[PDB]
Amino acid sequence: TLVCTANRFEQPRSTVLAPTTVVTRQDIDRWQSTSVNDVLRRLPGVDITQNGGSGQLSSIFIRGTNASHVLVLIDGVRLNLAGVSGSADLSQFPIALVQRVEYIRGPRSAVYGSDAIGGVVNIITTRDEPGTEISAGWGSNSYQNYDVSTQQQLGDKTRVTLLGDYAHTHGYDVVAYGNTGTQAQTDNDGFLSKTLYGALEHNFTDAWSGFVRGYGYDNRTNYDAYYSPGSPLLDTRKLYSQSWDAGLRYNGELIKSQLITSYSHSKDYNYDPHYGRYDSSATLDEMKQYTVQWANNVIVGHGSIGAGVDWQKQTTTPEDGYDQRNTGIYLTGLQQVGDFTFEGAARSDDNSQFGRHGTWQTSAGWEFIEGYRFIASYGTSYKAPNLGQLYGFYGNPNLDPEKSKQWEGAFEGLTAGVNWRISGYRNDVSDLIDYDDHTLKYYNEGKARIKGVEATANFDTGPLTHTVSYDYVDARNAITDTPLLRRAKQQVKYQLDWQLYDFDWGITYQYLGTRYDKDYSSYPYQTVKMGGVSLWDLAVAYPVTSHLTVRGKIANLFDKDYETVYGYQTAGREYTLSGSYTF
Ligand code: CNC
Ligand SMILES: CCCCCCCCOCCOCCOCCOCCO
Ligand SMILES: CCCCCCCCOCCOCCOCCOCCO
Ligand SMILES: CCCCCCCCOCCOCCOCCOCCO
Ligand SMILES: CCCCCCCCOCCOCCOCCOCCO
Ligand SMILES: CCCCCCCCOCCOCCOCCOCCO
Ligand SMILES: CCCCCCCCOCCOCCOCCOCCO
Ligand SMILES: *SCC1=CC(C)(C)N(O)C1(C)C
Ligand SMILES: [Ca+2]
Ligand SMILES: [Ca+2]
Ligand SMILES: [Ca+2]
Numbered sequence: 033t034l035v036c037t038a039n040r041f042e043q044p045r046s047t048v049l050a051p052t053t054v055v056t057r058q059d060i061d062r063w064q065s066t067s068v069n070d071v072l073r074r075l076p077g078v079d080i081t082q083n084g085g086s087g088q089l090s091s092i093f094i095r096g097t098n099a100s101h102v103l104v105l106i107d108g109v110r111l112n113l114a115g116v117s118g119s120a121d122l123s124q125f126p127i128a129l130v131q132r133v134e135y136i137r138g139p140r141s142a143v144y145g146s147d148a149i150g151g152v153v154n155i156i157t158t159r160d161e162p163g164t165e166i167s168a169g170w171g172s173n174s175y176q177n178y179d180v181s182t183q184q185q186l187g188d189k190t191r192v193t194l195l196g197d198y199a200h201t202h203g204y205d206v207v208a209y210g211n212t213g214t215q216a217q218t219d220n221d222g223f224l225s226k227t228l229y230g231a232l233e234h235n236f237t238d239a240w241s242g243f244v245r246g247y248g249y250d251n252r253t254n255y256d257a258y259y260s261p262g263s264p265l266l267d268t269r270k271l272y273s274q275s276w277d278a279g280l281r282y283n284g285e286l287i288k289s290q291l292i293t294s295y296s297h298s299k300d301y302n303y304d305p306h307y308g309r310y311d312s313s314a315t316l317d318e319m320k321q322y323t324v325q326w327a328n329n330v331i332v333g334h335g336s337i338g339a340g341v342d343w344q345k346q347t348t349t350p351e352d353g354y355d356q357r358n359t360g361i362y363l364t365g366l367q368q369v370g371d372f373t374f375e376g377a378a379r380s381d382d383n384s385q386f387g388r389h390g391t392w393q394t395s396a397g398w399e400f401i402e403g404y405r406f407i408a409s410y411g412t413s414y415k416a417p418n419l420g421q422l423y424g425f426y427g428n429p430n431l432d433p434e435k436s437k438q439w440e441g442a443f444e445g446l447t448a449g450v451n452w453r454i455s456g457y458r459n460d461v462s463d464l465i466d467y468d469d470h471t472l473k474y475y476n477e478g479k480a481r482i483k484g485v486e487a488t489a490n491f492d493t494g495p496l497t498h499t500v501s502y503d504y505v506d507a508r509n510a511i512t513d514t515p516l517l518r519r520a521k522q523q524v525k526y527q528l529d530w531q532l533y534d535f536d537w538g539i540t541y542q543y544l545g546t547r548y549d550k551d552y553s554s555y556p557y558q559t560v561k562m563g564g565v566s567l568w569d570l571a572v573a574y575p576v577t578s579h580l581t582v583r584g585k586i587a588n589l590f591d592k593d594y595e596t597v598y599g600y601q602t603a604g605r606e607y608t609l610s611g612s613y614t615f
Contacts, residue, residue, distance in 0.1 A: 037134040037154040039143060039338055039364040039377070040108065041288050041329045047366065048136070049375050049395035049407050051076065051442070051455060051486060055133040057159060062529075062538050064571050064585045064608055066169075066177070066199070068122045068130060072153065074527065074540065076486050076501045077137050079520050081596040082123070084206035085603045086175075087223025087253040090123045093519050094150030095137060096482035096507030097436075097459065101149035101415055103140065107157050107245070108325075110147070110344070112273060112296035114317040116420040124271055125155070126227040126249050128179055128197035132156040137486070138457070139438050141391040141413030142377035145342065145360045149413045149436045149461070157247065158231065159183065159193070169610030171585075173220070174202040177610065189235040197227040206256055209599030210552030213258035217267065221254040241281045248274035264304040264313035273298035286331045288338075294323040318349035335367040353423030357384040358416070371399040381414075385422060389414055389433055403446040410439050421465050421474045428474045436461045450491035457484050460510070479510035497529040517559070518597065520545045538571040549598035565594045582611045 038048040045052055053075045065071045069090050073080045079093040091099035100118025104111040111120055133155050140148040164182035169175070181195040203222040229247035236242065253269040279292035296319075303314035322345045329338030342360040362379035378392040393411030400406060417431035440457035464478030485504040492498070503523045507516040515521075522545035529538050546564045550557040568589040575581050585608040594602055 035134050035136075037105070037108075037136055037152060038140075039329065039336075039366070040290070040327045040340065041336075041338065043336075043366070047368075047373065047375075049373060049397050049409065050136050050138040050140075051453065051488075052137070053133075053135045055135075057131045057161075060127070060130060061612075062536065062571065062573060063540070064583055064610065065127055066175070066608070067127055068125050068155070071127070071130065071133060072122065072135075073542070074525055075135055076488055076525070077151070077484070077503050077505075078135075079503075079505070079523065081518050082602065083208070083597050083600045084221060084255060085203055085601075086201055087123055087203070087225070087251070088206060088221065088255055088600070089121050091119055091518070092122065092153070093507075094153075095457065095459065095484050095486075095503075096505040096516065096519055097150035097461065098516075100418070101147065101434075101436075101461075103144055103146075103148035103152045105144070105152065105154040106275065107277060108154065108292065109275075109277065109294045109296075109323050110144075110321070111155075112275070112298050112319060112321050114271075114298040114300040114319045114348070116317060116348075116418060116424070118415065118418045123223075123253075124225075124249075124251050124273075126197060126199065126225055126251075128195065128199070128227050129157050129229055129247060130155055131159040138409060138440060139391075139393055139411035139413035139436060140377075141381075142379045142393045142411065143362055143364060145358065145379065145381050146383075146414060146416040146433070149415060149434075149459075157229070157245070158233075163614055165612055165614050167610065167612040169583075169608055171608035172606040173204055173222075174200075175606075175608065176200045191231075191233045193229075193231045193233075195227070195229040197225075199223075199225045203254070204601065204604070207599060207601045208256040210554075211258065211599060212256055213260055215259045217256040217259065217265075219254065219256075221256060223254070224252045226250050239282055239284055241283070243277070243279050243281075245277040246275065248272070264308070266302045266304055266313065266315065268303050268305050268308075270301045270303070270309065271298065272300075288329045289327070291326045292323075294321075294325075296321040316349065320347045321345065329364070333367055334369065335365070337363075337365045339363050348419065352427075352429065353419050355384075356419075358382070373397040373399075383416060385429065386417065386432055405444050407442040407444070408440070409442075410437075412437050417465060424474075426467055426472060426474050431465060431474060432463055432476050434461060434465060434476070435463050450489055452487075452489040454487045455485065457486075458482070459484075480508065480516065481510040482507045495530050495532070497527075499527040499529070501525045515548050517548050517550065520547045520564075522546075534575055536573040538569075540569040540571070542567050544594070544596070547596075551598055553599075560598060562595065562598065565592055566590075567592055567594075579615050580611065580613050582609075584609050 036042045077095045082090040094102045104120045137151040167179045169177040178198045183193045206221045227249040231245040233243045251271040257267045276295045282289040300317040303309045324343040327340035344358045346356045360381045364377045366375045376394040380390045391412045395409040397407040414433040438459040442455040444453040459482040461480040463476035466478045483506045487502040490499045524543040526541040547562045571585045573583040587606045591605040
C-alpha cells in the first residue's frame with residue numbers, strides 16, 4: 033500500500049524504514065469513530081489525554097514527547113493553531129473530513145521542519161470515490177449527526193467534490209475538579225460542530241494536474257472554569273476556521289513535481305455567554321497562515337532523490353511579536369542495493385526570530401533472510417519557540433529551538449502468516465523552554481530522556497483478523513529523573529475483526545497504564561498516581577441493502593469510570609446508531 037508522507041511523494045510502505053501506520057476511510061467507518069482522537073488513540077506509540085469528552089481539549093503525546101512535539105499536517109500543511117500554546121487540539125478537527133491518516137513515527141524535521149519530533153500525523157481530506165452519500169446517527173447524551181457528500185465528474189478531466197456535516201452533542205458534566213474556582217459547574221458540557229468542504233481536481237494532461245480546495249468549520253464547546261462571584265466565567269469557546277489550498281502536480285515516468293499554495297485563517301473566542309464574545313472579558317486568539325511549498329523527486333538508480341523549498345508566514349491578531357516567517361530547504365534520498373535499503377533527509381531552516389537551524393536523519397535496513405529485516409536509524413529534530421514563550425508576560429524573545437536526538441533499532445518479520453515488528457528507541461530532548469523562577473523569564477534549559485519500545489503484529493486466525501500493539505515509554509526529566517506528567521508508561525491495544533453472515537463485527541480493547549498528574553485543588557500542587565484501566569468497545573455493521581448500511585456501537589462497554597487528566601470526567605458507556613445510503 034502507498035504512502036506519500038515520508039518524503040512528500042508516493043512510495044511503497046516497505047520502502048519507508050521508519051514505523052508507519054495508515055488508516056483508511058474504510059477503517060474509520062467500521063470503527064464508527066466520531067472524532068480524530070478516537071482514530072488516533074488506537075495506533076502505535078500514541079497517548080491521548082483529554083480534559084473532558086467530545087469537543088474539550090485533547091493533547092497527543094507521541095512516543096513520550098510533549099504535546100507540541102508532534103507535527104500534525106492537514107493534507108501536508110501544518111495545522112493552523114491560533115493559540116499561543118504549542119499544541120494542537122484535535123478535538124476540534126471534524127472527523128467528517130478525515131479520508132486517510134498517514135502516521136510516521138520518529139523524527140522528520142529533516143523534511144518538514146519544526147514540530148516533527150515524536151513523529152508526524154498527516155490527515156488527508158481527499159477521497160477518490162464517485163457517487164453521493166447521505167448519512168446520520170443518534171446516540172447517548174443527545175448525540176446527533178447528519179452528513180451529505182458527493183463526488184462527481186463535471187465533464188472530461190474535471191472532478192467536483194462537496195461535503196457538509198452537522199454534529200452535535202449535549203455531553204455530560206466534565207467536572208474539572210481543582211480548576212473550578214470557588215464553586216463547581218454541574219452543567220453538561222456539550223459540543224456543536226458544522227463543517228463545509230469543497231474541492232476541484234483537473235487534468236491538463238495525463239501528467240499535469242491541478243486542484244483547488246477549501247473547507248471550514250464553525251465549532252462551539254462548553255467547558256468548566258474558574259468561578260469567582262460577580263466575575264465573568266469564561267466557560268464557552270467559539271472556534272471558526274477556514275483553509276484554502278491550490279496546487280499543481282507533475283507525475284512523470286521518472287520526474288515528479290509539486291507546487292502547493294495554502295491559506296488558513298482561524299478565530300477562536302472564549303467567553304461567558306451572559307453579555308459575551310464581544311465584550312472585554314471575552315478572549316480572542318486569531319491567526320492567518322500562508323504556505324508555499326515546491327518539491328521535486330526523481331527516480332534514479334534503485335530508488336530516488338528529491339529536494340524542496342518551503343515557505344511559511346503566520347500572522348496573529350493583537351506590541352512585540354504578531355508576525356513570523358520561516359523558509360526551509362531540504363534534500364531526501366533512498367536507495368536499494370542487494371538486501372540493503374538506505375534512506376536519508378537533511379534540511380536547513382531559516383526563521384525570522386531564531387534564524388538558522390539544521391537537522392538530518394538516516395536509516396539503514398538489512399533483509400538478512402527473506403521476509404526478515406533489521407533497521408537502524410538516527411535523526412535530530414526541533415521545535416520552534418511559541419509566541420507566548422517569546423513575547424508573553426514571561427517572554428524571552430531570544431529563545432532557541434528545543435532540540436532532539438533520536439536513535440532506534442528494529443527487527444521486523446513475517447513468520448507463519450504473522451507480520452510483526454519490534455523497535456527500541458531513545459530520544460534525548462534538550463534546550464527545553466522552561467520558566468525560570470529567579471528571573472521571571474523563559475529560558476532554554478530543560479532536558480528529557482525518553483526510552484521506549486514498540487511491538488506490533490497482525491495476523492488472521494480463521495475468519496478473524498487480529499491487529500495488536502504494545503508500547504513501553506519511560507519519559508523522564510533527565511536532570512531530576514522524575515517521570516514526565518500525563519504520559520501512560522505502557523499501553524496495550526487490540527482490535528479483533530470478523531464477518532459472520534453479513535454482520536461485520538469489531539471489538540476494540542485498550543489498556544491505559546499508570547500515569548501521573550498534578551492535583552490542582554490545593555497549592556503547592558501535588559503529583560498524584562492514576563491507576564490504570566482496561567476499556568472495551570463493540571461495533572456492528574450490516575448491509576441492509578446494497579445501498580444502505582446500518583451500524584451500532586457501544587463505547588466503553590463495561591461502564592468504566594476513569595480519567596486521563598486528573599479531575600476531568602471521561603465518557604462512560606455510550607451507544608451510537610447510524611446509517612449510510614449510498615447511490
Ligand atoms: C496551565 C494552563 C492550563 N490550561 Co489553559 C488555561 N487557563 N492554559 C494553561 C497555560 C498553558 C501554558 C503552560 N503550559 O503554562 C496557559 C496560561 C497558556 C493557558 C492558556 C489557555 N488555556 C485556556 C483554556 C480555556 C483552558 N486551559 C486549560 C487547558 C488549562 C489546563 C487545565 C488542566 N489541564 O488541568 C491548565 C491549568 C494546565 C495544563 C497542564 O498542566 N498541562 C500539563 C502538560 C504536561 O500537559 P499538556 O497536555 O502538554 O498541556 C498543555 C496544554 O494544556 C496547553 N494548553 C493549555 N491550555 C490550553 C488551551 C487550549 C485551547 C489549547 C489548544 C492548549 C492549551 O499547554 C500545556 C503544556 O504545554 C483548560 C482545560 C482549563 C479549564 N478546565 O477551564 C481550558 C481549556 C478548556 C477547553 N476544553 O476548551 C485558554 C483558552 C484561556 C483563555 N480563555 O485565554 C488559553 C488558550 C491557550 C491556547 N493555546 O489556545
Ligand atoms: C545521494 C545524495 C543524497 C542523499 C540525501 C540524504 C542525506 C542524509 O545524510 C545521510 C548520511 O548517511 C550516510 C551515507 O549512507 C546512507 C545514506 O543514505 C543516502 C540516501 O540514499
Ligand atoms: C547532508 C548531510 C548532513 C550531515 C550533517 C552531519 C554532521 C553535522 O556536524 C555535526 C553536528 O554539529 C555541528 C558541529 O560539529 C562540530 C562541533 O565541534 C566544535 C564545537 O565547539
Ligand atoms: C540541497 C539542500 C541542502 C540542505 C542541507 C541542510 C544541512 C542540515 O544541517 C545538518 C547539520 O546541522 C548542524 C550543523 O549546522 C550548523 C551550521 O554550520 C555552518 C557554520 O559553520
Ligand atoms: C529477529 C527475529 C529472528 C528471526 C529468526 C528467523 C530466522 C529464520 O527464518 C525462518 C526460516 O524459515 C523457516 C520457516 O519454515 C519454512 C516454510 O516453508 C514452507 C514451504 O515449503
Ligand atoms: C533490537 C530490538 C529492540 C527491542 C528490545 C526490547 C527488549 C529490551 O531488552 C533490553 C532491556 O531494555 C532496557 C530498558 O528498555 C528500554 C530501552 O529502550 C531502548 C532505548 O535505549
Ligand atoms: C515482542 C517481543 C518478542 C519478539 C517479538 C515478537 C513480535 C511481537 O509481536 C507481538 C507484540 O505484541 C506483544 C509483545 O509483548 C511483549 C513485548 O515486550 C517487550 C518489552 O520490553
Ligand atoms: S501524502 C503527501 C500529500 C498529501 C496531500 C496534501 C494530499 N498532497 O497533495 C501530497 C501528495 C503532497
Ligand atoms: Ca441541542
Ligand atoms: Ca459542567
Ligand atoms: Ca460549563
